[PDB]
Amino acid sequence: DISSTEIAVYWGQREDGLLRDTCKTNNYKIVFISFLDKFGCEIRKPELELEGVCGPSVGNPCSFLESQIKECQRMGVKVFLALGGPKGTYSACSADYAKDLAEYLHTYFLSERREGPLGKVALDGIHFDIQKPVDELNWDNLLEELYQIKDVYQSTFLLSAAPGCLSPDEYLDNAIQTRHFDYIFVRFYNDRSCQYSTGNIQRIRNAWLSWTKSVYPRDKNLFLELPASQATAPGGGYIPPSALIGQVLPYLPDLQTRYAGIALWNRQADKETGYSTNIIRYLNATAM
């Protein structure tokens, strides 16, 4: 229901501030470290670069984040690594590379097995933000390979995706049809066919409906990914918090069985506008 809303947020740029500060707000159940955005056939050991935050090009090692990640986790925040995003050159390449990459993710991010880009960590999941890949092949294979690893090691890490709001998604449909994703964060913005606009919820309600049919199993596994400010939604889709709570959420089909919460693009914008804070105030403690 609305009261059980969980909030995820994207973090990974200078303007987002500290990962620690993000987690310690208590506003978020999930933080996506964003993004591993340079990988593909001949990239044997992908390197993490967080814009203005860490990586070889910045001169501050991403491994400094290990302690912050672990404190996030200790206070119950799930920390995911997000693949892809709006920039970079990324490809799952081939069936073979999909296995190599899944193993890399497991070894270096999901198991504390070796020192990796974020230090020695076991992240809570891998998030497929496949919005601008080289192309559409092999994302299903990557997901399959990660899913199989989880079974090999009886791991608890989660797998999630962020498709666009018109179903079927051009890049992620085959992956989503495997049913291996735990969570789907549908990007209801930058698309007039399926996003909110002032006084008009029909397109977003209809798109949500479409996604409830498209995504199996029929669990509480669907989130709305939304921009946290008008400026992070140049193509539209921003939903004022009062409208989200009053005009949109109550009217989502299968709200009571499918709705898990929302994700906010991005931490900087959320800080600027107070979006999640306001959401929590309303949906949370509507009556104390």
Kindly give the pairing relationship between strand 183-187 and strand 38-39.
unpaired
**Exposure b/e, 11-21, CB count within 10 A at least 16 = b:** bbbeebeebee
In whole angstroms, what is the distance from residue 212 CA to residue 207 CA?
Answer: 9
Q: Facing residues of 227 across strands?
A: 265
Alpha helices in the chain (DSSP H): 19-24, 66-74, 95-109, 139-153, 173-177, 202-214, 241-243, 255-258, 267-273, 275-283
The residues, ordered by sequence, that sit 6+ positions from 155 with a Cβ below 8 Å of its Cβ are 106, 110, 111, 149
> Using CA atoms, how far apart are residues 161 and 177, in angstroms rounded to an integer?
12
CATH topology of domain 1-288: TIM Barrel (3.20.20)
Q: Work out the number of other CB atoms within 10 angstroms of the CB of residue 220.
A: 16
CA distances from 11 to 15, 231, 271 (A): 9, 17, 11
- What amino acid is encoded at 181 in this protein? F
Q: Is 31 left (phi over 0), alpha (psi -120 to 50) or beta?
A: beta
Q: For residue 80, give the amino acid letter.
A: F
Q: SS3 of 197, please? A: strand
The technique by which this structure was obtained is X-ray
